[PDB]
Design a protein around this ligand. Structure first.
Ligand SMILES: O=C(O)[C@@](O)(COP(=O)(O)O)[C@H](O)[C@H](O)COP(=O)(O)O
Ligand SMILES: O=C(O)[C@@](O)(COP(=O)(O)O)[C@H](O)[C@H](O)COP(=O)(O)O
Lengths: 139, 481, 9, 481, 161, 81, 9, 82
């Protein structure tokens, strides 16, 4: 299965030139950029692991491209994403996020159904990779 | 007699009828305060009536005046409570139409209550015999009064965080046909649409609890369809459950059920009324739910330029009550919408402050005192063949909804959903790379290029290629540039 | 005109 | 592919766009059933649009249709759920206006719910680009559906019994000025007016709870004024306490307080909304209170003949919800009102059955299935000098209200109240003896004769002798005789 | 290491301790707004402490500041949330006493809550080692904030009645 | 209740005092606890304000606490105001 | 006309 | 869930729902008003309602006197048993 989190997941994996252009678009707005990693893709897993501090006043995509290159050869198999933050009054939140690296294979998830009162069910979403191996060796 | 000797002989408080403009309701040299509420009215006087007298009549009958002199006024600080007409101007390119500005004291209104504000501004003035037509065009609500209202329960920023979705418009669809389906068939459509790639689906405004389908059945099957789709894609999904009902008690019963089964969102209709709406917005904040507002009935009074209330005013009132989403127009769809007026609506719902902009219908500068933003919704006869226009006119904070444009696909509902998502992703990417996607040639070619890697999209483009709705608009601007 | 911005401080 | 091989090739269910009139929404040979809901619309087509296509579009978009073909229709008994246009005719003396009749199946609506009925009839049709204007003129609500609603909580018959008052119109007045008075000064006016001879007084629609006067203070002083006046005259008296508020919880808190202190009646405003109104009418029946409805906001959509909703429809909906009183017009006052249209309104609210009457705007025959009667209220710039006209146009089941016409008397509030009661008593007596009181000469002489035994009345006649409001009406009839 | 390469080098957001008056908490050319909350404090500086630094310390520790630089400030509209000292005057007929005026943004407080207002104005400033004594003399509460509170239940007028 | 004996407990306050959103608040809690703190706390002046409503803060904080406890094998917590 | 009373039984 | 008083009936209905029963049953000897109350509860709580016709043959057996069962059928379909 293909994980559909992010804004461009219905398009093929993007090339390095493609990634650089999107970065160039965020810096022209004055946004701060950062890179994150994880091996637990549950949709309610809000905090991915941080790769260094956010690049606040960098004004050249080459600096961002370099950092992503390092993570790629340094981190274990899993997922990597690039985010952009806007600290303007009225926003003070993230304004863009897309995946930029995937594992060779993703088995996906399945549902568990606990029966409670009347006809009500309490659902739990479960990951095949997580349930099988500890962090660092899931993919 | 004692009564005869105690008669008031003052020129202003002696019994009898005098013009409203001599009663103290007209003041050209009035100085406006930062706590005052202001209103702009488009008035059409009856043959013979003086334009200034008409303005003074509207101000008096919407504040503290009646048709004849009353001495009881002397038991109060009368001058402080009277509303004041302070400017009157002819409408450009028109004879018999005039614009009128009116100021109201802060102490005239009850804190945090929309029923009270409207009781004064729109209570009885529209039925006065001395005017032939009347329309409320705009209002300036001061910072002090804004602080007595909650504002949106969730707000655009917190909502995108709840869905983990950033940097692109959200997507959705309505279940069709409008009426006739059972609860089990309803869940099947939801499962299919979400699985193909929609963020949300919704019940029609007229779906509540009927002989062909009772509400409890629909809510149960829908939660099974949502969980199935989320587990198959790895994304957070949802459907707008309709809690509209005949009595407040029944509304609350349906809201508490949806929360129990774990719904992230619910929807209400405008026909319910201001007080029911305010109660629902307070409940959503106290129970962590998103609140969607359908505007059923608005066009009975917001369509004609000569009489009624302009939608931009409704936008302000609903942002004050605290709804999270609201329908606001598509420009190219099958319902009414002038591009300049629509851009005005979107600004009123998303900005932190408004500056005067006549061509857009913005008459008053106004700050939102840190009230959260309300998300606009675009719906009504639109298709993936028009993606380039939607991105250019509606912006990035918006929910694009496709009912017939999804279920009407020849290869199934899942195929329809895929064609819509792909079209959007390709257009945004191209935009961010600096292309002229709005050009009548570049835009369609971009979609054609994407179509050569997605069969569903190719099929949809060929099917609705020559589909458009061109008709003269009813509500238009009065200024240019 | 531009007197609407000065007539409503 | 499996999807490509399983494509629908039926002429009616193949993908694509076809006219609404070929989708099954137009049927000139349709036979109406006694369980069907019917509607009459005045439509104005855009240049080029066929009159029959417009009618078919309104029927489809208000029932189960969308802009393109959907196969999901085959999972339902489609033919039974589709609304059907069955008659279209040009409006007399007009070009570009047409009348359209439409029938709806009983199973389309939720039992006992006004929000649901309106969601279908007025939801989105008024905003369609293909029409330039639209107006709902009338409706036929069947016996079967009427039986799912409560109807008036008290009703005219039970109410006259609660007051021990029979055989003459009731009398009342509004406290003035509209805003600014304290709770203690409010009670003083109530005491004075009732003591002079009024049956009831009322708070203004915009009086709720404000800095100059909090509600609990007003309710306490008013009950002291009512008991004082009743003990001094030997009659049952009362005042309409306003319970309008921003949230349902606050509404209930104010209703329970008024009942605790022993109020016989309370009042609500139309700006509150349908769902809040229905809840209040159920509470009044369960707690033995009379419920008065002020129609604040109605003229935003009920004033123009080309677009909106006619008041006679609002009359039917409110009688179904179960209010006990409703404002309905004066003809000779300062607010809009054509005599033929007004007579239609009064009949809709008081009769046990309606028969077709075009000159009065009655388009459908209809029985009320034993629902109780709603009492009409006449208010707005009227004076005792017009008594002969009021008796002739408004009838005997009505509340005549005099605000400025009572407080504006030079000799005090008690004097004003006396002049109004005497004028009425003399006119009814004369009528019952068989006189032509409506003649422009007999009527005034009758009042003059009575005045020679009552100084207050003499003073009032001389003061408002030449007072009238003559202006061309906006909402008029389309038939004569 | 990634952490070492991603260290902040900006003069204002590099790690370390700097005076409160250079952190943006002193602004003699500040323009007061009609929505701002204002406070007047009588301060007595410790021997050696500059009168202006003391005022800046009171403003920072009663708003959003701490004893050392934090980069997390860049995740917020920092300039809007900082309180600002804008005037300092010697107390007449006194040596070692000064009056200080301070302005606070409306969005810093919870509507209708006195516990919250006091938590900011009198929370910990009175125990600061750098001052020897301190007194809150007056405050200007704006119209906008007043409207979120009930005010007297009865009031003098209704009570006499 | 904490299974901690024979040494002072450790903690920290979230900074800056005011201005952060509920999601950014949870991020700091997750980070601090994961590095080895027993507890973190809201500032005395953090309650419910326009920049952050209380229900949002409480939800994100419990996600940060559970994540840190599962990654270290220790009982953790944060003082909710 | 009078066909409105016969068209709606 | 048949019992001697309405309060005891409700106590047994709420227990069965808590443990997750898809269905419950009642007897005709309970009476029309108790039956109507139970049918309203089942709709509001998503349970199936079975009706046993204990006592019907005391008046529905002979052709010369009593009530024919087809009438009882209509009344019970109106009350709302499943
Ligand atoms: O009932 C309908 O017609 C819709 O579901 C459209 O479905 P389609 O996608 O099939 O057209 C929407 O409610 C309208 O857009 C409402 O209008 P508005 O947004 O202007 O309030
Ligand atoms: O506010 C007012 O103007 C009135 O109190 C009139 O007082 P006066 O007696 O002093 O005129 C009534 O509410 C109007 O009649 C309402 O109009 P309608 O009945 O048409 O809904």
């Amino acid at each position: 299965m293909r994980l559909t989190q992010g804004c461009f997941s219905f398009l093929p994996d993007l090339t390095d030139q493609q990634i650089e252009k999107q970065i160039a678009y965020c810096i022209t707005k004055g946004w701060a950029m950062n890179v994150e990693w994880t091996d637990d893709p549950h949709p309610r897993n809000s905090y991915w692991e941080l790769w260094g501090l956010p690049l606040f006043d960098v004004k050249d995509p080459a600096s961002v491209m370099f950092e992503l290159r390092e993570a790629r050869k340094s981190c274990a198999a899993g997922y990597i994403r690039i985010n952009a933050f806007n600290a303007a009054y009225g926003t003070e939140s993230c304004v863009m996020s897309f995946i930029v690296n995937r594992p060779s294979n993703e088995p996906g998830f399945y549902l568990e159904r606990q029966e409670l009162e009347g006809r009500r069910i309490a659902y739990t979403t479960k990951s095949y990779s997580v349930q099988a191996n500890p962090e660092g060796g899931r993919y | 007699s004692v009564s005869e000797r105690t008669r008031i002989k003052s020129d202003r408080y002696e019994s009898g009828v005098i013009p409203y403009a001599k009663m103290g309701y007209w003041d050209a040299a009035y100085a406006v305060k930062n706590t005052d509420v202001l209103a702009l009215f488009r008035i059409t006087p009856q043959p013979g009536v003086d334009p200034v007298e008409a303005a003074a009549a509207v101000a008096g009958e919407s504040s503290t005046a009646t048709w004849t002199v009353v001495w009881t006024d002397l038991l109060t600080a009368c001058d402080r409570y009277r509303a004041k007409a302070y400017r009157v101007d002819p409408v450009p390119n028109t004879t018999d139409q005039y614009f009128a500005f009116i100021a109201y004291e802060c102490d005239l209104f009850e804190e945090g209550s929309l029923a009270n504000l409207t009781a004064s501004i729109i209570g009885n003035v529209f039925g006065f015999k001395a005017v032939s037509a009347l329309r409320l065009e705009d209002m300036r609500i001061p910072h002090s009064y804004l602080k007595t209202f909650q504002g949106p329960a969730t707000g655009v920023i917190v909502e995108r965080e709840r869905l983990n979705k950033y940097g692109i418009p959200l997507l959705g669809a309505t279940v069709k046909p409008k009426l006739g389906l059972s609860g089990k068939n309803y869940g099947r459509v939801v499962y299919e649409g979400l699985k193909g790639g929609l963020d949300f689906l919704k019940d029609d405004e007229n779906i509540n609890s009927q002989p062909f389908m009772r509400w409890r059945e629909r809510f149960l099957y829908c939660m099974e369809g949502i969980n199935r789709a989320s587990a198959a894609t790895g994304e957070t999904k949802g459907s707008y459950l309709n809690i509209t009902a005949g009595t407040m008690e029944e509304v609350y019963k349906r809201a508490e059920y949806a929360k129990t089964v774990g719904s992230i969102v619910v929807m209400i209709d405008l026909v319910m009324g201001y007080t029911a709406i305010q109660s629902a917005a307070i409940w959503a904040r106290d129970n962590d739910l998103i609140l969607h507002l359908h505007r059923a009935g608005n066009s009975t009074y917001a369509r004609q330029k000569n009489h009624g209330i302009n939608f931009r005013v409704i936008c302000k009132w609903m942002r004050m009550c605290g709804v999270d989403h609201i329908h606001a127009g598509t420009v190219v769809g099958k319902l009414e919408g002038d591009p300049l007026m629509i851009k005005g609506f979107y600004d009123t719902l998303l900005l932190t402050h408004l500056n005067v902009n006549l061509p857009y219908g913005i008459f008053f500068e106004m700050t939102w005192a840190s009230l959260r933003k309300c998300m606009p919704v675009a719906s009504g006869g639109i298709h993936c063949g028009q993606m380039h226009q939607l991105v250019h006119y509606l912006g990035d904070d918006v929910v694009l909804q496709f009912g017939g444009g999804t279920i009407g696909h020849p290869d199934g509902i899942q195929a329809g959903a895929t064609a819509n998502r792909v079209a959007l992703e390709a257009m945004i990417l191209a935009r961010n790379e600096g292309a002229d996607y709005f050009n009548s040639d570049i835009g369609p070619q971009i979609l054609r290029n994407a179509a050569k890697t997605c069969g569903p999209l190719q099929t949809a483009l060929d099917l609705w290629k020559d589909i458009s709705f061109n008709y003269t608009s009813t509500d238009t601007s009065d200024f240019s540039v | 005109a531009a007197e609407w911005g000065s007539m409503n401080q």
